[PDB]
């Protein structure tokens, strides 16, 4: 809101690639053309730019796996922040968008209240009580990036509860966010229904190697018909994984 919305998208010190740099110059020009077009157009352009970066990476695929994971973590954080900031200036009610690369985004801007809310799209759906998004009108968003292989390749899965693991993501990286920043101690549990999936099936998220898949308290209610229902007590970038030992 203070015309510093796009200043966070910078390449971390140490990295040196000619594709990430061009992507960040593109987002800088996007911020330049953000006070003129529309909040509903800058968001679509951000999604399309992320799709361009993910679909055709240059020397990003030649980066070290820790550096790629750090890039992915920063990218997901920045995407959540930008989506919150842009949705803060949208008309009240649902906002749905599907990129040509099938990157699905849904939002729900509405007043504060304690009304049960169901929202989502094909790749992810949510069943939350609105008393947890209020923490101005509240925001609840779902950003599902289908292809995230290059940045998330050679990642490690840590369960924190408890040798070898053969990770294979089965669903899109569904990033969930609300208005309040403290997104790890939600009062009422959230119900998720992710798709595209289908020796174990887990609901794990991307926890800041610079990043690793972590379970950390997300009960898998069950899987059926290529869709797993997870009950989670926090909000992060969730993705179903197969944990072939």
């Amino acid at each position, epitope marked *: 809101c203070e015309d510093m919305t796009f200043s966070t998208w910078t390449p971390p010190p140490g990295v040196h690639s000619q594709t990430l740099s061009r992507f960040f110059d593109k987002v800088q020009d996007l911020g330049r053309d953000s006070k003129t077009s529309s909040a509903e157009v800058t968001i679509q352009n951000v999604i399309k730019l992320v799709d361009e970066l993910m679909e055709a990476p240059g020397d990003v695929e030649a980066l070290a796996p820790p550096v790629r994971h750090l890039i992915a973590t920063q990218l997901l954080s920045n995407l959540e922040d930008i989506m919150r900031i842009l949705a803060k200036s949208l008309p009240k*009610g*649902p*906002f*749905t*968008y*599907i990129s040509p690369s099938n990157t*699905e985004l*849904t939002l*729900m801007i*509405q007043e504060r*209240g304690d*009304k*049960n*809310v*169901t*929202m*989502g*799209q*094909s790749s992810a*759906r949510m*069943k939350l009580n*609105w008393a947890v998004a209020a923490g101005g009108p509240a925001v609840a968003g779902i950003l599902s990036i289908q292809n995230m292989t290059t940045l998330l390749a050679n990642a490690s899965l840590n369960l924190h509860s408890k040798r070898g693991v053969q990770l294979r993501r089965l669903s899109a990286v569904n990033s969930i966010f609300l208005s309040h920043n403290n997104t790890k101690e939600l009062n009422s549990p959230i*119900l998720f*229904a992710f798709s595209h999936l289908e020796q174990e099936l887990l609901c794990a998220f991307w926890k800041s190697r610079g990043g690793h898949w972590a379970t950390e308290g997300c009960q898998v*209610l*069950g899987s*059926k*018909n290529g*869709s797993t*229902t997870c009950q989670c007590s926090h909000l992060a970038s969730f993705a179903i994984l197969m944990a072939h030992y």
Partner: antibody
Amino acid sequence: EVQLVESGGGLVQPGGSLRLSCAASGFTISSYSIHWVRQAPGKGLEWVASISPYYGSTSYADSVKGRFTISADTSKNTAYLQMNSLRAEDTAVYYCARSWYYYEQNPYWYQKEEQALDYWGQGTLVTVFN
Amino acid sequence: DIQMTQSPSSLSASVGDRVTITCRASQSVSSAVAWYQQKPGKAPKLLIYSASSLYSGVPSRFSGSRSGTDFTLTISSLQPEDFATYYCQQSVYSPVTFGQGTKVEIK
């Protein structure tokens, strides 16, 4: 494929009787409910009756419970609707749909009794002329 | 019975415009509200069931949500074959009730 073909509709005088038939092909009616939905000319959709042949579970509307009788014969795999004591308010286009209990899709996400009419018929026209 | 109230009952849009139809319901139907589309002279076709789930074959541009007793159907980008009449239905409590119907017309 799944097809529902209605029949039996036509002209009728008030106070008369008319029996509608809805033949179901491509599936067995013994696992879904066969709703009957009418639509008055130029008006919105309106429920009329429902049937669950494996349970019986006859259910009717308010302006309908007194006269219409809905039956389903598993031998012929068709559902009927024996409309009677017809009035001028019953002129409409009657569709037969197939109620689909989608609970078994995601039993951890849906409720037991949720249903939706996924395959509709084509609609037979009933005219009540005085 | 649950009276399904619908708005605006008549909508004039264009190609590419986002279209939202509201189906606020009396009492409280939790999430079982389905959306149908009826082109003139044709039988209705199921679009969305359980207020958020897309039926098989429906384009992905259709989306739904629930906000208590308020159910909305949104179309991400309108297309020339999307101009028809839309109804919302509940089956939780007998009798099942349909919406009054919202008609979408070209601009």
